[PDB]
Write a protein that binds this ligand. Structure first.
Ligand SMILES: Nc1ncnc2c1ncn2[C@@H]1O[C@H](COP(=O)(O)CP(=O)(O)OP(=O)(O)O)[C@@H](O)[C@H]1O
Ligand SMILES: Nc1ncnc2c1ncn2[C@@H]1O[C@H](COP(=O)(O)CP(=O)(O)OP(=O)(O)O)[C@@H](O)[C@H]1O
Ligand SMILES: Nc1ncnc2c1ncn2[C@@H]1O[C@H](COP(=O)(O)CP(=O)(O)OP(=O)(O)O)[C@@H](O)[C@H]1O
Ligand SMILES: [Mn+2]
Ligand SMILES: [Mn+2]
Ligand SMILES: [Mn+2]
Lengths: 288, 288, 288
């Protein structure tokens, strides 16, 4: 919805946004929103996401699709009305994104997802990009478990010429919906083939916001499918624009830079990662 | 589906993926998946592939088309539900790719298809590419024979101005689907007219993963029509990204370089091939 | 169809392909496929070709258009199934190209269509290109006459601002279909207005293979319509690609080079032609 501010209320917002990344307990936003999703009375649409055609499919809290949902509306604080209707497995009325309130006045945050190696990491969308054979796949997985911490991370696989990878975009949005409904730390390998369809355009535009709203982190390998030229900036500015955080390889072996948006209008942070390979191409991020 | 990992189960996956290439018996994954396909219940749709329009046609285990199929849903381990329905010869519900699970938890592999001249070769898609008219046709044939070994290889012909060559994309994808259903080693000559329709974009995106999942190898001649300029990266990298392996001509006559993706996040291997022509342009790949 | 090979059967294939060009009596493949066409039942579709919209029109063995044809299916040796149906003048089911099997196991040939001046010429598509008033029109007619030998050659006219030229693409494909069904040596003047519609894109992909399968030669004048700055590189390379043979002008007046693909995987031959004009711009190819 829209929000109104004066100097005082705006100072409060910013303080609250600063706190959401800097001082709230890591993973707390996800547990909260998990609570909100659990208390949703079953059958209620919770999430809508674009398929390849530009239409949207709709999910309930248990990540099952909704085929049929008759018009229901809700009135917000700002006087606006949200409506949801699902017909023949497609959204007839509504919008893309979360269809129940996970934030609730607190908007423009990058909720802290995890802490590792003396650094806090934001929820939202993390794009891992860089020079060909940068070691992107090993890096998303290392980031996956590191930020998972005590929890397992979910791996969504897409569009690579390896065994068991889905290459159908609609199954892909279904995997991603399920991941974000059920898990705090999610890896996508990869976005190569998404980079276009309306679904693909919707996805890039929608996912960071959906993830941030949830307080989960989606760690997505990108990669320009052509050129080791200065195309390492087009997708890396499509990266810069649609990502909460950016992880880029450097000229130094095994070294990466992490750039994080810490919230709305707040300062962007930078830190470095050192990494090395063990057996079977398992990568470790160095910490202590 | 999506898969959940912690450090320990990930290390087991990488061990398992490494083995699928490096220590499994060659052609063993193909025999296994032949066994899975054999054991499906009669009439079960097994494979869907995009036709020119972007719709999908569906095949059973004996590479015969299915034209009508009442909606059947199956619930995967990750809570995902897969649905398949076919009407008037066209998929009405489902996805492109394999419609039964060939892989399970074991995904992200490049299962060894064959061993020849002291080197292991991956299943999936191998694109053969190079300068102008570089001897691609003779090489895809020698490589088919060689990887076939005890078995005959299947030849799918498409889009060249020579006798008996199909030029209809929809007959092409029917040929490809049957080839992958029934044979471990498949040669495609050529992909030049594919490089786009919706079906053509789908084929390029799907075929490597379909082949890798089956344990079969598709050896495809490419070719840009025009330019020896830096279109020798435009069709390429469109190759190094859609392909499990690349075979590229060098500046030395008869010499080729093989670049192999051995698995998800695993090391890319390189080796060289020396070749010579015998009678009637039959190419031999040197070994010992 | 798809075809299976081992070393020995591939060796046989290449020998048969080599003989189809080098040792068969010239024009014998044309006479062979004529016999196959004469054997098909009355009313049966033999050939489908793309019209402007990308729909296909269908012809019978006597080059008459089929408007209605009840669904009939046919199962080839490889297990593949062809379904042909015509309805309201347009292919409801089937594929572009030959609808009956003209070639069998003998595929990937460039069947000798004629001999003239001590050179064998291939059936298929011969694109005549170069320069800009190199004398393309006189050359296609001289080549038509010479390859015709004892037979008259057929002239298909299209898209030139001269008396009696068809400029309608659907009449063009009707002319080309009839020509290939009835004559071994066909001249097309010219392809400038086809170089895009779906039909126009279908033609360039289809006709080399259609002609080679029949054992007829289509001698097509191409011509760039605009530019002369490395556009002669583009069309000479986009020609090299959809053509069985290329005839190219040189920097020497009246002189042309002929580049011939002699079959699948086989050696490409080159020879030169010297020519001169007599009365009324009638061109003679010098021989002996
Ligand atoms: N033991 C090891 N030592 C050094 N590098 C290794 C390694 N194991 C894997 N790698 C590197 O890690 C990469 C990970 O696999 P891939 O997914 O194939 C490439 P990527 O960097 O993710 O980019 P791309 O797939 O987007 O092109 C390999 O290409 C390889 O360069
Ligand atoms: N005995 C021999 N010695 C040397 N070269 C030979 C040969 N027999 C065949 N070739 C070459 O091998 C090629 C046969 O395959 P072709 O289909 O004609 C070209 P290609 O490299 O596959 O790419 P293209 O078809 O995309 O142009 C020809 O270029 C031919 O010159
Ligand atoms: N007596 C003569 N002496 C020399 N050249 C002659 C000639 N009579 C005709 N020509 C050549 O043949 C051409 C006639 O064919 P046109 O169709 O007019 C051009 P083209 O070379 O076929 O290419 P275009 O039609 O694709 O532009 C003339 O432009 C000229 O180059
Ligand atoms: Mn990768
Ligand atoms: Mn070739
Ligand atoms: Mn002309």
């Amino acid at each position: 919805m829209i929000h109104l501010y004066d100097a005082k209320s705006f100072a409060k917002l910013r303080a609250a946004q600063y706190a959401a990344f800097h001082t709230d307990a890591p993973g707390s936003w996800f547990d909260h929103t998990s609570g909100v999703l659990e208390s949703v009375e079953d059958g209620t649409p919770v999430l809508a996401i674009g398929v390849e055609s530009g239409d949207a499919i709709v999910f309930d809290k248990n990540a099952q699709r909704i085929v049929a949902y008759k018009e229901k509306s809700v009135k917000a604080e700002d006087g606006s009305v949200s409506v949801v209707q699902v017909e023949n497995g497609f959204m007839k009325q509504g919008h893309r994104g979360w269809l129940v309130d996970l934030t609730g006045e607190l908007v423009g945050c990058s909720p802290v997802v995890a802490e590792f190696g003396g650094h806090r990491y934001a929820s939202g969308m993390v794009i891992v990009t860089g020079k060909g054979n940068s070691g992107k796949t090993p890096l998303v997985h290392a980031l996956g478990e590191a930020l998972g911490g005590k929890d397992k991370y979910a791996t969504v696989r897409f569009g690579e010429p390896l065994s068991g990878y889905n290459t159908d975009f609609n199954v892909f949005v279904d995997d991603i919906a399920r991941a974000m409904l059920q898990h705090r730390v999610i890896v996508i390998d990869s976005l190569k083939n998404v980079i276009i369809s309306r679904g693909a355009f919707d996805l890039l535009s929608d996912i960071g916001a959906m993830a941030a709203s949830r307080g989960c982190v989606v760690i997505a390998s990108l990669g320009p499918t052509s050129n080791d030229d200065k195309i390492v900036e087009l997708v890396k500015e499509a990266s810069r624009s649609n990502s909460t955080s950016l992880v880029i390889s450097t000229d130094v072996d095994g070294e990466w830079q992490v750039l994080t948006r810490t919230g709305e209008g707040l300062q962007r942070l930078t830190h470095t990662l050192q990494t090395s390979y063990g057996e079977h191409s398992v990568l470790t991020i160095h910490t202590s």
